[PDB]
Design a binder for this molecule. Structure first.
Ligand SMILES: Cn1nccc1C(=O)Nc1cccnc1
Ligand SMILES: Cn1nccc1C(=O)Nc1cccnc1
Lengths: 469, 469
């Protein structure tokens, strides 16, 4: 079973002996520190609150096991057993911590406070930064959701330019990163952060997380279609790629089907196998059930352009109202290899260059969507800004001489709306002057209880694009 | 509860309809495909076998829950309920799958077979690639342990060059990546992969994983020392950093203590505070309990050099047998900011340039050790190479025309020792000819049971450096 006493950075175990004596309060905050990615999607905190932080998290057995581990881990008896006993006795293992946070899904610019953490009991001053490590890990669902949303803007910009609308926008970027993530739990968290912006996913784990921790009125927040992998094709034999294609498109004739065709020669399959041999099986398919050709190798941009040109001369192409070329509705293309935010831009710009509408293309990202993200990307940091010693509250902060970009904020923080509708974080407890609006931060966790929740439907509404509004 | 039926890629649910009819066997393998990092550390498979694959992994409830989700996920009823009921009824939920693998800890060059997967029942041909996604996720503990071991080589190369020995080599790279990872499960897996090569860790979660899934004769596989964070320093006020330093070095006067000093001015803390104001507290410290100054900002190389040069002219410096400068035993340094495999090389080379010994320095790595890694780095892949249809077995493979580096192996594979004592992967069942030795791959999983295990002590022995041997 998970033990929160074993879920922190090792050196934090020795931090209760390092704070100034007579300290009754430790007040820390979280931010995507300033110095692309100018605005971030706040999401994932609620998951951590329910799974790891809420309820009775401290027992007699967990204190003992922690004491035994740290005894050997440090070769010394540095462990605030007395501090963890106080929480067990006076609060029945419930954490005396108050967490205020901006509503999940909210798109806040860089350099703003996203959530604040403080203790509600003067004895548990050390508890504030004990749970830093576990709260910092919300950087990942924030980063995934933010980067997925930035890719959505690119998709939206080019789709509108070449088609005239945003039809099927939330199905332009599919999640392939189940096998590409570091762990099972990661896949669930990551896929759920992608579903904030899109509806297409293959990481099944992300569905159960949302249903349990957030919830949707629809049965599921994500969907998928029958598709093929290289094994289901190559197992027929190198001389039976046509038999493989025909068997698959017939098994799924009334539903959308994606077939990978780069097993031996992607350009041969499209022109000869799809475009001649099995051309009769494609032109008969319904609009609601087209064939989706999936290339998986070569230069991403160059392959897509070459695939389209091949299909263009083997299938009746129409020029849309915007002047861009569109395949017949029974044939689409999905690029699911080596696609991140950088190459996504390069591809759709290349398609616009060759007068190809974005209607023709769908994208699949794996490690680039879920794994190729760090905490340095959005500068997600957790710092202390306020403490009270001897009954005197002082404003604390870090300010390295060689790096102004690592400077922290001072005093009690509060998020507000500017007169121009933008955001502003007030420092030094200036929010109590009420020269601005009400503090946007709502208490979501207090004394071991989740005090405010958000459904996944609310998060989707909050994280909408401006072009969609 | 974990559901293996919900732990696969979405499109893999529809794959049982796509294989050629009368398919009795699906035989797939795993490799760190060819075309630095020329040899990889095999590790993490045993964890996935025990936690996810072994025992009764199929129940009536899990089959129903999977059916209900996939029904809504696909808006249709494509789900091999008959296939998952066969396993439940005939094998009591136990997976009829045989997995052969190279002993964990083994350092195998790129392009070799690490493990193989096949079905032991002709009815469960579709089962081999269903569990691809979960077995592929072993890329992470492999990639971490490999990249960690590569950094160990660099440390060993310079430490030996500048000290004459390798004393304390396994404490030169400390894990800080608990807050830098995507999830809790990741933190445990990653830290355990780093502990294969080092003993310095702050990610507590990794210890419980090893004890449960691998085990060591020593109480714990990892260790840590009392250290300070920015909050435990700044809380004293900006005008009382000296009082902060003094209080911490006194609380831990008999044990090694690491104190961060980049809060306001790193170069002032070393020369004025450590080097003048509190110099008397440092020179009295034991050799087994020194002060470890920790910078955390500015250019990693430039900061370390300047810090060392400062400490050089405030504290008595000795010159070892190798001619490299050495701090007194009661004074050491640890750089734990922006340290990956690339910058690590830059720092130690810079230290050798300025006649500084590696004995003086230790390194802390967070996101670079546990997060800044993808499945692309080592080209970890899982492809089918052999199937049996209509009684006849055929050697299958993929071979993209535009990318020769994605070509897969053919037929039944086996790993052997070359006459020169190196590794080689035999294809097309040439291993049965027995022109080489016996197959080095051991059966580690069969019909739901773990048939072979390795302790973390064996894995550590197998992952030793050639310089250590
Ligand atoms: C295009 N498509 N539609 C449904 C599923 C897929 C697909 O290709 N998925 C996928 C996931 C992970 C790795 N490879 C392919
Ligand atoms: C230098 N040191 N010695 C023991 C622990 C640490 C340390 O600074 N750890 C750490 C962990 C995570 C983030 N930041 C620092």
């Amino acid at each position: 079973e998970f033990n929160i006493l074993l879920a922190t950075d090792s050196y934090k175990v020795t931090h209760y002996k390092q704070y100034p004596p007579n300290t009754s309060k430790v007040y820390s905050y979280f931010e995507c520190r300033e110095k692309k990615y100018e605005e971030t999607v706040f999401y994932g905190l609620q998951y951590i609150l329910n799974k790891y932080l809420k309820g009775k998290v401290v027992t007699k057995e967990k204190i003992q096991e922690a004491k035994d581990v740290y005894k050997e881990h440090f070769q010394d008896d540095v462990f605030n057993e007395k501090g963890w006993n106080y929480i067990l006795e006076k609060y029945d293992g419930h954490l005396p911590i108050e967490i205020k946070a901006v509503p999940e899904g909210f798109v806040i610019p860089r350099g703003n406070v996203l959530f604040t953490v403080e203790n509600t009991d003067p004895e548990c001053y050390w508890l504030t930064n004990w749970i830093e490590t576990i709260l910092v890990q919300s950087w990942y669902p924030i980063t995934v959701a933010t980067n997925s949303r930035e890719q959505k803007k690119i998709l939206a910009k080019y789709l509108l330019e070449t088609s005239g609308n945003l039809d099927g926008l939330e199905y332009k970027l599919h999640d392939f990163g189940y096998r590409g993530v570091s762990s099972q739990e990661t896949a669930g968290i990551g896929a759920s952060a992608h579903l904030v912006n899109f509806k297409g996913t293959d990481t099944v784990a992300g569905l159960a997380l949302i249903k349990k921790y957030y919830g949707t009125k629809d049965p599921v927040p994500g969907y998928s279609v029958p598709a093929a992998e290289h094994s289901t094709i190559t197992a027929w034999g190198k001389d039976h790629e046509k038999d493989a294609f025909e068997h698959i498109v017939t098994q799924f004739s009334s539903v959308p089907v994606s077939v990978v065709s780069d097993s031996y020669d992607i350009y041969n399959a499209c022109e000869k196998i799809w475009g001649e041999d099995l051309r009769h099986l494609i032109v008969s398919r319904s609009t609601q059930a087209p064939l989706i050709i999936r290339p998986d190798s070569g230069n991403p941009l160059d392959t897509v352009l070459k695939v389209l040109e091949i299909l263009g001369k083997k299938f009746p192409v129409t020029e849309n109202s915007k002047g861009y070329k569109l395949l017949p509705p029974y044939l689409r293309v999905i690029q699911g290899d080596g696609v991140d935010i950088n190459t996504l831009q390069e591809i759709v710009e290349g398609m616009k260059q060759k007068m190809w509408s974005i209607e023709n293309i769908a994208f699949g990202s794996g490690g680039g969507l879920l794994q190729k993200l760090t905490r340095d990307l959005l500068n997600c940091s957790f710092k202390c800004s306020y403490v009270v010693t001897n009954g005197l509250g002082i404003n604390v902060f870090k300010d390295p001489v060689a790096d102004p970009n690592k400077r922290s904020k001072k005093g009690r923080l509060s998020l507000h709306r500017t007169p121009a509708g933008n955001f502003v974080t007030l420092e030094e407890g200036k929010g109590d002057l009420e020269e601005y609006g009400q503090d946007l931060l709502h208490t979501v966790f207090k004394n071991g209880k989740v005090t405010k929740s958000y459904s996944f439907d609310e998060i989707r509404k909050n994280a909408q694009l401006n072009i969609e509004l």
